[PDB]
Nucleic acid binder design. Structure first.
Ligand SMILES: [Mg+2]
Ligand SMILES: [Mg+2]
Ligand SMILES: [Mg+2]
Ligand SMILES: [Mg+2]
Ligand SMILES: [Mg+2]
Ligand SMILES: [Mg+2]
Ligand SMILES: [Mg+2]
Ligand SMILES: [Mg+2]
Ligand SMILES: [Mg+2]
Ligand SMILES: [Mg+2]
Ligand SMILES: [Mg+2]
Ligand SMILES: [Mg+2]
Ligand SMILES: [Mg+2]
Ligand SMILES: [Mg+2]
Ligand SMILES: [Mg+2]
Ligand SMILES: [Mg+2]
Ligand SMILES: [Mg+2]
Ligand SMILES: [Mg+2]
Ligand SMILES: [Mg+2]
Ligand SMILES: [Mg+2]
Ligand SMILES: [Mg+2]
Ligand SMILES: [Mg+2]
Ligand SMILES: [Mg+2]
Ligand SMILES: [Mg+2]
Ligand SMILES: [Mg+2]
Ligand SMILES: [Mg+2]
Ligand SMILES: [Mg+2]
Ligand SMILES: [Mg+2]
Ligand SMILES: [Mg+2]
Ligand SMILES: [Mg+2]
Ligand SMILES: [Mg+2]
Ligand SMILES: [Mg+2]
Ligand SMILES: [Mg+2]
Ligand SMILES: [Mg+2]
Ligand SMILES: [Mg+2]
Ligand SMILES: [Mg+2]
Ligand SMILES: [Mg+2]
Ligand SMILES: [Mg+2]
Ligand SMILES: [Mg+2]
Ligand SMILES: [Mg+2]
Ligand SMILES: [Mg+2]
Ligand SMILES: [Mg+2]
Ligand SMILES: [Mg+2]
Ligand SMILES: [Mg+2]
Ligand SMILES: [Mg+2]
Ligand SMILES: [Mg+2]
Ligand SMILES: [Mg+2]
Ligand SMILES: [Mg+2]
Ligand SMILES: [Mg+2]
Ligand SMILES: [Mg+2]
Ligand SMILES: [Mg+2]
Ligand SMILES: [Mg+2]
Ligand SMILES: [Mg+2]
Ligand SMILES: [Mg+2]
Ligand SMILES: [Mg+2]
Ligand SMILES: [Mg+2]
Ligand SMILES: [Mg+2]
Ligand SMILES: [Mg+2]
Ligand SMILES: [Mg+2]
Ligand SMILES: [Mg+2]
Ligand SMILES: [Mg+2]
Ligand SMILES: [Mg+2]
Ligand SMILES: [Mg+2]
Ligand SMILES: [Mg+2]
Ligand SMILES: [Mg+2]
Ligand SMILES: [Mg+2]
Ligand SMILES: [Mg+2]
Ligand SMILES: [Mg+2]
Ligand SMILES: [Mg+2]
Ligand SMILES: [Mg+2]
Ligand SMILES: [Mg+2]
Ligand SMILES: [Mg+2]
Ligand SMILES: [Mg+2]
Ligand SMILES: [Mg+2]
Ligand SMILES: [Mg+2]
Ligand SMILES: [Mg+2]
Ligand SMILES: [Mg+2]
Ligand SMILES: [Mg+2]
Ligand SMILES: [Mg+2]
Ligand SMILES: [Mg+2]
Ligand SMILES: [Mg+2]
Ligand SMILES: [Mg+2]
Ligand SMILES: [Mg+2]
Ligand SMILES: [Mg+2]
Ligand SMILES: [Mg+2]
Ligand SMILES: [Mg+2]
Ligand SMILES: [Mg+2]
Ligand SMILES: [Mg+2]
Ligand SMILES: [Mg+2]
Ligand SMILES: [Mg+2]
Ligand SMILES: [Mg+2]
Ligand SMILES: [Mg+2]
Ligand SMILES: [Mg+2]
Ligand SMILES: [Mg+2]
Ligand SMILES: [Mg+2]
Ligand SMILES: [Mg+2]
Ligand SMILES: [Mg+2]
Ligand SMILES: [Mg+2]
Ligand SMILES: [Mg+2]
Ligand SMILES: [Mg+2]
Ligand SMILES: [Mg+2]
Ligand SMILES: [Mg+2]
Ligand SMILES: [Mg+2]
Ligand SMILES: [Mg+2]
Ligand SMILES: [Mg+2]
Ligand SMILES: [Mg+2]
Ligand SMILES: [Mg+2]
Ligand SMILES: [Mg+2]
Ligand SMILES: [Mg+2]
Ligand SMILES: [Mg+2]
Ligand SMILES: [Mg+2]
Ligand SMILES: [Mg+2]
Ligand SMILES: [Mg+2]
Ligand SMILES: [Mg+2]
Ligand SMILES: [Mg+2]
Ligand SMILES: [Mg+2]
Ligand SMILES: [Mg+2]
Ligand SMILES: [Mg+2]
Ligand SMILES: [Mg+2]
Ligand SMILES: [Mg+2]
Ligand SMILES: [Mg+2]
Ligand SMILES: [Mg+2]
Ligand SMILES: [Mg+2]
Ligand SMILES: [Mg+2]
Ligand SMILES: [Mg+2]
Ligand SMILES: [Mg+2]
Ligand SMILES: [Mg+2]
Ligand SMILES: [Mg+2]
Ligand SMILES: [Mg+2]
Ligand SMILES: [Mg+2]
Ligand SMILES: [Mg+2]
Ligand SMILES: [Mg+2]
Ligand SMILES: [Mg+2]
Ligand SMILES: [Mg+2]
Ligand SMILES: [Mg+2]
Ligand SMILES: [Mg+2]
Ligand SMILES: [Mg+2]
Ligand SMILES: [Mg+2]
Ligand SMILES: [Mg+2]
Ligand SMILES: [Mg+2]
Ligand SMILES: [Mg+2]
Ligand SMILES: [Mg+2]
Ligand SMILES: [Mg+2]
Ligand SMILES: [Mg+2]
Ligand SMILES: [Mg+2]
Ligand SMILES: [Mg+2]
Ligand SMILES: [Mg+2]
Ligand SMILES: [Mg+2]
Ligand SMILES: [Mg+2]
Ligand SMILES: [Mg+2]
Ligand SMILES: [Mg+2]
Ligand SMILES: [Mg+2]
Ligand SMILES: [Mg+2]
Ligand SMILES: [Mg+2]
Ligand SMILES: [Mg+2]
Ligand SMILES: [Mg+2]
Ligand SMILES: [Mg+2]
Ligand SMILES: [Mg+2]
Ligand SMILES: [Mg+2]
Ligand SMILES: [Mg+2]
Ligand SMILES: [Mg+2]
Ligand SMILES: [Mg+2]
Ligand SMILES: [Mg+2]
Ligand SMILES: [Mg+2]
Ligand SMILES: [Mg+2]
Ligand SMILES: [Mg+2]
Ligand SMILES: [Mg+2]
Ligand SMILES: [Mg+2]
Ligand SMILES: [Mg+2]
Ligand SMILES: [Mg+2]
Ligand SMILES: [Mg+2]
Ligand SMILES: [Mg+2]
Ligand SMILES: [Mg+2]
Ligand SMILES: [Mg+2]
Ligand SMILES: [Mg+2]
Ligand SMILES: [Mg+2]
Ligand SMILES: [Mg+2]
Ligand SMILES: [Mg+2]
Ligand SMILES: [Mg+2]
Ligand SMILES: [Mg+2]
Ligand SMILES: [Mg+2]
Ligand SMILES: [Mg+2]
Ligand SMILES: [Mg+2]
Ligand SMILES: [Mg+2]
Ligand SMILES: [Mg+2]
Ligand SMILES: [Mg+2]
Ligand SMILES: [Mg+2]
Ligand SMILES: [Mg+2]
Ligand SMILES: [Mg+2]
Ligand SMILES: [Mg+2]
Ligand SMILES: [Mg+2]
Ligand SMILES: [Mg+2]
Ligand SMILES: [Mg+2]
Ligand SMILES: [Mg+2]
Ligand SMILES: [Mg+2]
Ligand SMILES: [Mg+2]
Ligand SMILES: [Mg+2]
Ligand SMILES: [Mg+2]
Ligand SMILES: [Mg+2]
Ligand SMILES: [Mg+2]
Ligand SMILES: [Mg+2]
Ligand SMILES: [Mg+2]
Ligand SMILES: [Mg+2]
Ligand SMILES: [Mg+2]
Ligand SMILES: [Mg+2]
Ligand SMILES: [Mg+2]
Ligand SMILES: [Mg+2]
Ligand SMILES: [Mg+2]
Ligand SMILES: [Mg+2]
Ligand SMILES: [Mg+2]
Ligand SMILES: [Mg+2]
Ligand SMILES: [Mg+2]
Ligand SMILES: [Mg+2]
Ligand SMILES: [Mg+2]
Ligand SMILES: [Mg+2]
Ligand SMILES: [Mg+2]
Ligand SMILES: [Mg+2]
Ligand SMILES: [Mg+2]
Ligand SMILES: [Mg+2]
Ligand SMILES: [Mg+2]
Ligand SMILES: [Mg+2]
Ligand SMILES: [Mg+2]
Ligand SMILES: [Mg+2]
Ligand SMILES: [Mg+2]
Ligand SMILES: [Mg+2]
Ligand SMILES: [Mg+2]
Ligand SMILES: [Mg+2]
Ligand SMILES: [Mg+2]
Ligand SMILES: [Mg+2]
Ligand SMILES: [Mg+2]
Ligand SMILES: [Mg+2]
Ligand SMILES: [Mg+2]
Ligand SMILES: [Mg+2]
Ligand SMILES: [Mg+2]
Ligand SMILES: [Mg+2]
Ligand SMILES: [Mg+2]
Ligand SMILES: [Mg+2]
Ligand SMILES: [Mg+2]
Ligand SMILES: [Mg+2]
Ligand SMILES: [Mg+2]
Ligand SMILES: [Mg+2]
Ligand SMILES: [Mg+2]
Ligand SMILES: [Mg+2]
Ligand SMILES: [Mg+2]
Lengths: 97, 146
RNA sequence: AGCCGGUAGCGGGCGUGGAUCCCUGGAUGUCCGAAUGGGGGAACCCGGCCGGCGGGAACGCCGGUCACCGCGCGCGCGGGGGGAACCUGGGGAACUGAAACAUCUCAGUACCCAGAGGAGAGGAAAGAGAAAUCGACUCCCUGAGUAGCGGCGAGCGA
RNA sequence: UGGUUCGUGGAGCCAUGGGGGAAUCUGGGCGGACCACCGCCUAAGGCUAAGUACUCCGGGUGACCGAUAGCGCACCAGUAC
RNA sequence: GUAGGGAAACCGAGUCCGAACAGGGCGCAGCGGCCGCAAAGUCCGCGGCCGUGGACCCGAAACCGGGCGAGCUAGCCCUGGCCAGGGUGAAGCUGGGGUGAGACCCAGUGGAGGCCCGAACCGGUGGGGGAUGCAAACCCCUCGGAUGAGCUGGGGCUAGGAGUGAAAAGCUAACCGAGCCCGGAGAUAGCUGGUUCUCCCCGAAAUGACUUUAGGGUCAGCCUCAGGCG
RNA sequence: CGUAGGGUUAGGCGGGACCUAAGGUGAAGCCGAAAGGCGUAGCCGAAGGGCAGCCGGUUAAUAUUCCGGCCCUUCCCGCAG
RNA sequence: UGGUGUUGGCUCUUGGUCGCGCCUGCGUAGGAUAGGUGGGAGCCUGUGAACCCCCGCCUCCGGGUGGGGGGGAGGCGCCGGUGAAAUACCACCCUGGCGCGGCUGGGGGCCUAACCCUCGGAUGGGGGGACAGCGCUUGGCGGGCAGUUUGACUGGGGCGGU
RNA sequence: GGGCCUGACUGCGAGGCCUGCAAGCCGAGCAGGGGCGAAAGCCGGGCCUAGUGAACCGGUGGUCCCGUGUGGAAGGGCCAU
RNA sequence: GCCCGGAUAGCUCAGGGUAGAGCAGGGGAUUGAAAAUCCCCGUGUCCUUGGUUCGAUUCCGAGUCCGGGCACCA
């Protein structure tokens, strides 16, 4: 998955650390690491389709910032958006950020 | 997710009420179908504004009512007609009591808001209920004479 | 006071009316190249529009203009590509060392990529850390191979 | 999960992919789990010279080379091949 | 450097273990006649040797990164082209025989086929030659296929742990059990080789212990230099 | 082979100012940390489609190109129907 | 593959905790179906008693009880007989059973609007549908692939032996 | 063979054996509190030489030594296993 | 090392007031045997130990012994 259009959340590199043994705090000898390999953590990106100014606009957005979209719609009523392409409408919403 | 109902809805609430629903139900049903709008701070105030104006424009109609109540119960409208002991030859109607009320006391009235089933045919003193506003009835003593 | 590049010669010219030559600004600058009217096997080929040249309509040539993208209200402004190292960001090995090896090491190095400028980063405390203290950040010395981290191994290291 | 000396360690701090989700100073973060006390500091917007790095370029200077050396090239070399 | 002992709190010419005034461990104090010389220590220079670096020099087979390659070769895609001549004679069709109608039989016609023979073309079976070749795979004689799963021209697509492969680990630009180039890079090599003027004095070892150790190491043994003792 | 001079002549031959094939590229659109990967139309792409020249003469050296004879194509403008 | 996000509406049926309410508890001796202790000479009945009709019932089959139509001066306690343990009424609680209610959790059924597929027509229709896909996290299978390990002595090595 | 007993001690340890290291071994005597013996005295397991495993990580019982501003706590240290 | 089971007759299994059940074993009925069948009989500290009750196989505490289950191993 790519990038949140609202927050700019983005895939990151994380390690997958495999461990074995008993934790010291459980009276164990201790954890041993039996493998570290790279991996990626993707944002929980989802689709949000809203009807704005009589046009249908789609956002690719992290679930966390889904409400931030509907807010942009509310902040948009004061704007003059009719006649515009869905592309141009989306552009206006995203400058209200 | 709190929202403001724009219509009365089955086992959720009355219009104007602010109820709490699952986010999905609001985004995918209520909000796109115009049944409600999310209870933002921005339009929380808008609700407070229209409640504050509506009850204002309600009570003002109550004061426009009490104005004609204090006046009209505090007098008698006297109608000269032609008649023989009891029975009027013509009749006094709401339209009649109407034009009468202005010409005598300088106050306008609505015939249709006055309670007269059959037009008045007998001489005497009458009390006629008036309603320029529900729950604000105006009793009118009316004297028809020769 | 000589001069017409390395470069003599043939054959011809210029300079105290200041040449050659040196510095600055300007003019011209075919075609390709980010290449940008379109196409393309770089340096070739094929066009629209306005204006001009020919006897000129066909044909051809000359001059101007015509990509895509971003941002402000069809008009504007900007972007694109390059640059030895240096710099910031996004990615990121292995040999090797551990006298085998897997955690560890090599190393956030090599390398790829985006971006930047004569630098770049950082920067005006939601700091430090025990001084009842200090007072943005950067860079050098020192603190210190200290504190610590570590199959408490090899090493790593404020 | 990353960063830091810190390799799960008593593991804080800074950062954040996922979930849950405040407050506006009588608010909030930090002082290495945690709690009390005592202090320090004001997060979630931005800019900011100079002191620092480098050497395609120019000049200056060598107990630097002197044609198998010094640049791969003193010469028509990133050429011939 | 001037104070050490203790894991530490801490004490201190002492300290730690301990109940101890016990016992032990690790610690504590110049030559001349106040001048002088010497000295702890420390600073600089010089030399030997050690640690970190590629660390005495040359040498791998390999591992990793980013690129360059299908003008060779393998498969596939698009579009073209080529296969002398001779032989065999399927089905079907016609006619005739046949039967209740048929199957079916005969003749003729017909021209099928990963059919036969043999050039071109594609191959490469056996033998000889060649072997610092004409040639880093060739020449001669012979031999296989030759209408097909055929051969071939042009235009394309697929690649490095990847492609392609009627499968041989074959082939991927004349060495492929993992291509080539540049880079990490002076990888690493307990191995092999090599290591440059002179003279003078001394002069070994090839044993022991331990060692994923055995042709490598640490300590000891044995050599050497300096200061001291005698 | 060295030095020098000379030599390649097209509306009709081949290719382009025509067309599409695989494939490539690619307004729309989709996807990917970056670099980039896809992708309908469209565009590019030929030894395939399409398209008007045959015979002879000439030069030291070119010729369906020059010349000669006999033919033909497209574009522009005009007249007629 | 569990949890959770994206992820919604309406029902049905269960489970578990917490609170309240009501009941259940039968070896024997015995008035009979005696929970444990404790309080206790009085509780009830016109704020309806001994039988009767309806049933929730549970029965150990003798009985226990619940609501309801009967019903218009009365029932059990201390008394006491045998009890380890007295019988009335209260009261905290133990074993259970339910009735609500709180918060959890599991199934099933339908729905449509997220999301997915599709329809020469698309702010729409059809299908799937809160599943699937995708994010975060759990544990598992996993030579398909990766990095490696796989000792030494030795009358050569291996095998054997050590 | 029997009697009483737990020295199969605690705190140390002159001096040696063996020896590359690290280990392994023997040990008189002093102090504390004991056992046996009238006493002299003996007893720090076993007639003796095999019956074993450095360090790292961690467990448990003590100790109250450190405790990241302070008091505690977390976690360590030390003695024993 | 921690959690969860147990112990009841010869063998295997059932359970606050009983000690059971089956099969093994013995006689009897029956038979060509070999059985199937049918009737009767035995075989208890219910591991031990300590306490609850009025008393207990039960309830509890505790060890002994065998099981199962999970984790760890310098
Ligand atoms: Mg993980
Ligand atoms: Mg512990
Ligand atoms: Mg670990
Ligand atoms: Mg570890
Ligand atoms: Mg790594
Ligand atoms: Mg991986
Ligand atoms: Mg959605
Ligand atoms: Mg919508
Ligand atoms: Mg978030
Ligand atoms: Mg959220
Ligand atoms: Mg009238
Ligand atoms: Mg001249
Ligand atoms: Mg001359
Ligand atoms: Mg001249
Ligand atoms: Mg003059
Ligand atoms: Mg002048
Ligand atoms: Mg100039
Ligand atoms: Mg161009
Ligand atoms: Mg182009
Ligand atoms: Mg023109
Ligand atoms: Mg002319
Ligand atoms: Mg013209
Ligand atoms: Mg032209
Ligand atoms: Mg011209
Ligand atoms: Mg032009
Ligand atoms: Mg570029
Ligand atoms: Mg630039
Ligand atoms: Mg860098
Ligand atoms: Mg970086
Ligand atoms: Mg970087
Ligand atoms: Mg990688
Ligand atoms: Mg490595
Ligand atoms: Mg390695
Ligand atoms: Mg290294
Ligand atoms: Mg190694
Ligand atoms: Mg090694
Ligand atoms: Mg190895
Ligand atoms: Mg390694
Ligand atoms: Mg590592
Ligand atoms: Mg390195
Ligand atoms: Mg590193
Ligand atoms: Mg570099
Ligand atoms: Mg500067
Ligand atoms: Mg700057
Ligand atoms: Mg500020
Ligand atoms: Mg600072
Ligand atoms: Mg201060
Ligand atoms: Mg300040
Ligand atoms: Mg110091
Ligand atoms: Mg290290
Ligand atoms: Mg470290
Ligand atoms: Mg580290
Ligand atoms: Mg490091
Ligand atoms: Mg740092
Ligand atoms: Mg770190
Ligand atoms: Mg960490
Ligand atoms: Mg880390
Ligand atoms: Mg930490
Ligand atoms: Mg804190
Ligand atoms: Mg915090
Ligand atoms: Mg955090
Ligand atoms: Mg987060
Ligand atoms: Mg405050
Ligand atoms: Mg606060
Ligand atoms: Mg914070
Ligand atoms: Mg702080
Ligand atoms: Mg602070
Ligand atoms: Mg601030
Ligand atoms: Mg900040
Ligand atoms: Mg700046
Ligand atoms: Mg600066
Ligand atoms: Mg220079
Ligand atoms: Mg110079
Ligand atoms: Mg030379
Ligand atoms: Mg040279
Ligand atoms: Mg010379
Ligand atoms: Mg030289
Ligand atoms: Mg140079
Ligand atoms: Mg140069
Ligand atoms: Mg050279
Ligand atoms: Mg040279
Ligand atoms: Mg040259
Ligand atoms: Mg010390
Ligand atoms: Mg002591
Ligand atoms: Mg002493
Ligand atoms: Mg002493
Ligand atoms: Mg030497
Ligand atoms: Mg040395
Ligand atoms: Mg090296
Ligand atoms: Mg080095
Ligand atoms: Mg060296
Ligand atoms: Mg490797
Ligand atoms: Mg390897
Ligand atoms: Mg690569
Ligand atoms: Mg090919
Ligand atoms: Mg080819
Ligand atoms: Mg063909
Ligand atoms: Mg053929
Ligand atoms: Mg033929
Ligand atoms: Mg033939
Ligand atoms: Mg024949
Ligand atoms: Mg034939
Ligand atoms: Mg014949
Ligand atoms: Mg024939
Ligand atoms: Mg035929
Ligand atoms: Mg026939
Ligand atoms: Mg025939
Ligand atoms: Mg034939
Ligand atoms: Mg024939
Ligand atoms: Mg054939
Ligand atoms: Mg034949
Ligand atoms: Mg043949
Ligand atoms: Mg061949
Ligand atoms: Mg041959
Ligand atoms: Mg032969
Ligand atoms: Mg041969
Ligand atoms: Mg031969
Ligand atoms: Mg050969
Ligand atoms: Mg041949
Ligand atoms: Mg031949
Ligand atoms: Mg032949
Ligand atoms: Mg043949
Ligand atoms: Mg042949
Ligand atoms: Mg044949
Ligand atoms: Mg043949
Ligand atoms: Mg043939
Ligand atoms: Mg074929
Ligand atoms: Mg072909
Ligand atoms: Mg071909
Ligand atoms: Mg080709
Ligand atoms: Mg392929
Ligand atoms: Mg390929
Ligand atoms: Mg390639
Ligand atoms: Mg490869
Ligand atoms: Mg490679
Ligand atoms: Mg493999
Ligand atoms: Mg492969
Ligand atoms: Mg093949
Ligand atoms: Mg090559
Ligand atoms: Mg090659
Ligand atoms: Mg080859
Ligand atoms: Mg080979
Ligand atoms: Mg091969
Ligand atoms: Mg390989
Ligand atoms: Mg490889
Ligand atoms: Mg190889
Ligand atoms: Mg090759
Ligand atoms: Mg090559
Ligand atoms: Mg390179
Ligand atoms: Mg490099
Ligand atoms: Mg390296
Ligand atoms: Mg080397
Ligand atoms: Mg190696
Ligand atoms: Mg070696
Ligand atoms: Mg050599
Ligand atoms: Mg040598
Ligand atoms: Mg000597
Ligand atoms: Mg001698
Ligand atoms: Mg020796
Ligand atoms: Mg030896
Ligand atoms: Mg070993
Ligand atoms: Mg060995
Ligand atoms: Mg050997
Ligand atoms: Mg060996
Ligand atoms: Mg060796
Ligand atoms: Mg030695
Ligand atoms: Mg000696
Ligand atoms: Mg010596
Ligand atoms: Mg010496
Ligand atoms: Mg000496
Ligand atoms: Mg010539
Ligand atoms: Mg010529
Ligand atoms: Mg012509
Ligand atoms: Mg044209
Ligand atoms: Mg074309
Ligand atoms: Mg085309
Ligand atoms: Mg686009
Ligand atoms: Mg691009
Ligand atoms: Mg692009
Ligand atoms: Mg593309
Ligand atoms: Mg396409
Ligand atoms: Mg075209
Ligand atoms: Mg093309
Ligand atoms: Mg074309
Ligand atoms: Mg063509
Ligand atoms: Mg065709
Ligand atoms: Mg053609
Ligand atoms: Mg033509
Ligand atoms: Mg012709
Ligand atoms: Mg001719
Ligand atoms: Mg010729
Ligand atoms: Mg002609
Ligand atoms: Mg006309
Ligand atoms: Mg999962
Ligand atoms: Mg869900
Ligand atoms: Mg459903
Ligand atoms: Mg359904
Ligand atoms: Mg429906
Ligand atoms: Mg639907
Ligand atoms: Mg719908
Ligand atoms: Mg649809
Ligand atoms: Mg639909
Ligand atoms: Mg539907
Ligand atoms: Mg789902
Ligand atoms: Mg989870
Ligand atoms: Mg997993
Ligand atoms: Mg493997
Ligand atoms: Mg496996
Ligand atoms: Mg698999
Ligand atoms: Mg091993
Ligand atoms: Mg061996
Ligand atoms: Mg041997
Ligand atoms: Mg042997
Ligand atoms: Mg031997
Ligand atoms: Mg032998
Ligand atoms: Mg031998
Ligand atoms: Mg063996
Ligand atoms: Mg005895
Ligand atoms: Mg005795
Ligand atoms: Mg005694
Ligand atoms: Mg000694
Ligand atoms: Mg020793
Ligand atoms: Mg011993
Ligand atoms: Mg001993
Ligand atoms: Mg004594
Ligand atoms: Mg005595
Ligand atoms: Mg005595
Ligand atoms: Mg003694
Ligand atoms: Mg040890
Ligand atoms: Mg270790
Ligand atoms: Mg510990
Ligand atoms: Mg303890
Ligand atoms: Mg303390
Ligand atoms: Mg603290
Ligand atoms: Mg503290
Ligand atoms: Mg306190
Ligand atoms: Mg304290
Ligand atoms: Mg503690
Ligand atoms: Mg501890
Ligand atoms: Mg402790
Ligand atoms: Mg100890
Ligand atoms: Mg236990
Ligand atoms: Mg049993
Ligand atoms: Mg039994």
């Amino acid at each position: 998955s790519k990038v949140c259009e609202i927050s700019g959340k983005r895939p990151i590199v994380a390690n997958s650390i495999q461990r074995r043994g008993k934790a010291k705090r459980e009276g164990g000898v201790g954890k041993k690491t039996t493998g570290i390999s790279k991996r990626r953590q993707y944002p929980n990106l989802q689709k949000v389709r809203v009807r704005v100014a009589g046009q249908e606009i789609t956002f690719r957005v992290a679930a966390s910032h889904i409400p931030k979209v509907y807010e942009l719609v509310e902040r948009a009523k004061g704007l003059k958006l009719e006649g515009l392409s869905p592309k141009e409408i989306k552009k206006e919403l995203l400058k209200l950020l | 997710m709190k929202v403001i109902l724009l219509e009365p809805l089955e086992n959720l609430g009355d219009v104007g009420q602010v109820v709490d629903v699952k986010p999905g139900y609001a985004r995918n049903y209520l909000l796109p179908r115009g049944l409600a709008v999310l209870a933002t701070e921005s339009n929380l105030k808008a609700l407070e504004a229209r409640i504050r104006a509506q009850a204002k424009r309600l009570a003002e109609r109550k004061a426009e009512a009490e104005r004609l109540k204090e006046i009209l119960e505090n007098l008698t409208l006297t109608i000269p007609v032609r008649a023989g002991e009891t029975k009027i030859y013509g009749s006094v109607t709401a339209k009649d009591i109407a034009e009468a009320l202005s010409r005598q006391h300088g106050v306008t009235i609505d015939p249709k808001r006055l309670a007269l089933e059959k037009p008045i045919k007998e001489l005497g003193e009458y009390v006629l209920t008036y309603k320029p506003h529900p729950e604000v009835p105006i009793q009118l003593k009316v004297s028809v004479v020769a």
